[PDB]
Design a protein around this ligand. Structure first.
Ligand code: TFG
Ligand code: K
Ligand code: K
Ligand code: ZN
Length: 360
């Protein structure tokens, strides 16, 4: 059936209910699982992993040496789970990209976007989303790939992986606060290198939690930075590093923002307007079970084409806070040098959604 894909595998579970098991259960209980096609995953091959990572890294963490969660064998299993997470994502990406499925959501762990060429970090061993993109390039010759990363932390590995490639547009929305938030990378001025100059976009929020960024601020960032640039780029496939740690309920250092889960349904629906709807979302961060389950539900519902719960009038009427406007305007200023959609006008970043619409 030409519909929404899901990927999930119990061999990724720690105990052999955590995050991915709670999400899977929510999708079952709400009936959304019933409307999707659940595919079978597989371990990534060592060669696939080596499209992004070094042979030495892949051999060390990818190979089995041959479980109490409070021993070193917990981390050995997590590295195994990571190898499996990459093959689950690759499989879903290819089924959507070939037209077998319309779109997809990958319920996987551990996350991948912090993993660098030969350095695991931030709970990440292998960069699943980056590996998928490389394989779409090398095996299907896909001309344009947009990667959107809306986990609250900068996706340092994915930026690295494509920093000189103009055929892949990497766009990260993250808390930055002038280099004082993990992992410390992803300044707005990091725009790419060589031929890839201008094809790396760091929508970096600065100013701290005075006040925290919420729905109005991210919707405005999408209106002003993400969709204008993404539309002009005109990708053939969209991949999303879909972390949900920006949702309300994730405290100050391991989160700090007050997004609603509902807002991610709307962000998804917007992204569904590109690439003919060829979109796959892969779970990254977020850890509050209720928040990540609410958000995963909202995203899958959007992908299935269901009618979304209307955002509260309060959100639609809210002008973004001054820190958010300052942050958006700094990003636009830098990227006007590279994108026609940012050269034409002056900033309307301070308007609410209704105001932006009314003035059009
Ligand atoms: O910010 C992170 C994250 C690592 C990975 C994060 C993620 O992006 O949400 C991912 F990768 F899991 F999806 S978020 N840190 C910094 C704080 N931290 C800690 C803390 C230790 C002491 C006090 C507060 C936090 C343990 N491990 C970490 C990793
Ligand atoms: K991000
Ligand atoms: K790039
Ligand atoms: Zn995160």
């Amino acid at each position: 059936r030409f519909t929404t894909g899901l990927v999930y595998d119990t061999l990724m579970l720690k105990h052999q209910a955590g995050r991915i098991q709670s999400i899977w259960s929510r999708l079952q209980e709400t009936g959304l699982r019933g409307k999707c096609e659940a595919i079978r995953g597989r371990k990534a091959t060592l060669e696939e992993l080596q499209t992004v990572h070094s042979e030495a890294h892949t051999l060390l963490y990818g190979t089995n040496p041959l479980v109490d969660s409070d021993t070193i064998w917990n981390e050995v299993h997590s590295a195994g789970a990571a190898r499996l997470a990459v093959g689950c994502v690759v499989e879903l990406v290819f089924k959507v990209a070939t037209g077998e499925l319309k779109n997809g959501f990958a319920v996987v762990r551990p996350p991948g976007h912090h993993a660098e060429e030969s350095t695991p970090m931030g709970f990440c061993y292998f960069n699943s989303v980056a590996v998928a993109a490389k394989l779409l390039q090398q095996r299907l010759s896909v001309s344009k790939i947009l990667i959107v990363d809306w986990d609250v932390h900068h996706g340092n590995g994915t930026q690295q992986a494509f920093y000189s490639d103009p055929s892949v547009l990497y766009m990260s929305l993250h808390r930055y606060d002038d280099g004082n938030f993990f992992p410390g990378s992803g300044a707005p001025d990091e725009v790419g290198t060589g031929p890839g100059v201008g094809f790396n976009v760091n929508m970096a929020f600065t100013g701290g939690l005075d006040p925290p960024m919420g729905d109005a601020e991210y919707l405005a960032a999408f209106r002003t930075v993400v969709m204008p640039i993404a539309s002009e780029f005109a990708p053939d496939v969209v991949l999303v590093s879909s972390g949900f740690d920006a949702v309300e309920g994730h405290p100050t250092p391991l989160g700090g923002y007050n997004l609603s889960a509902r807002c991610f349904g709307y962000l998804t629906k917007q992204l569904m307007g590109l690439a003919g709807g060829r979109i796959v979302l892969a779970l990254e961060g977020g850890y509050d079970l209720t928040a990540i389950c609410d958000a995963s539900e909202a995203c899958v519902s959007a992908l299935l084409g269901n009618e979304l719960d209307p955002l509260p009038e309060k959100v639609l009427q809210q002008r973004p806070n001054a820190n958010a406007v300052r942050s958006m305007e700094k990003v636009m200023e830098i990227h006007s040098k590279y994108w026609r959609c940012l050269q034409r006008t002056t900033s309307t970043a301070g308007r609410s959604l209704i105001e932006a619409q009314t003035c059009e």
